Amino acid sequence: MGHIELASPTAHIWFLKSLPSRIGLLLDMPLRDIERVLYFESYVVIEGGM
């Protein structure tokens, strides 16, 4: 086998949309808002801080 260095990280669609979502009920975050974060129309915060 070979591999492709994907220059951006990329979500596996099986663990995103298997019904139920594994990333969905792993993050406690709805599948719609995860698809809105992944497809570049909304942001999600990481370590909001003060």
Binding site: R36, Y39, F40, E41
Partner: protein, 85 residues
């Protein structure tokens, strides 16, 4: 009149820009030196009441809008200013 992005068909940016120049739509694409600096992306300026986005989408040489969702993306005027290299 706010700035939109258009992904053109592959290798038809000249024809897409020609038809959008026959319409009253501003085009913007940096030429590097002569091939464009970007790929098939192109920046248009219009107003959706003057010329509608469906008429822009049905232009010879325009594949689609950069959408990200329902509505096509507004790019801010600081970006369009900072393509004046």
């Amino acid at each position: 009149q706010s700035w939109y992005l258009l992904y053109c068909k592959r290798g038809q940016l000249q024809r897409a820009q020609e038809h959008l120049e026959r319409q009253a739509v501003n085009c913007l694409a940096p030429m590097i030196t002569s091939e464009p600096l970007f790929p098939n992306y192109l920046f248009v300026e219009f107003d959706p009441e003057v010329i509608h986005t469906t008429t822009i989408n049905a232009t010879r040489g325009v594949s689609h809008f950069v959408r990200f969702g329902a509505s096509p993306a507004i790019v801010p005027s600081a970006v369009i200013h900072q393509l004046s290299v």
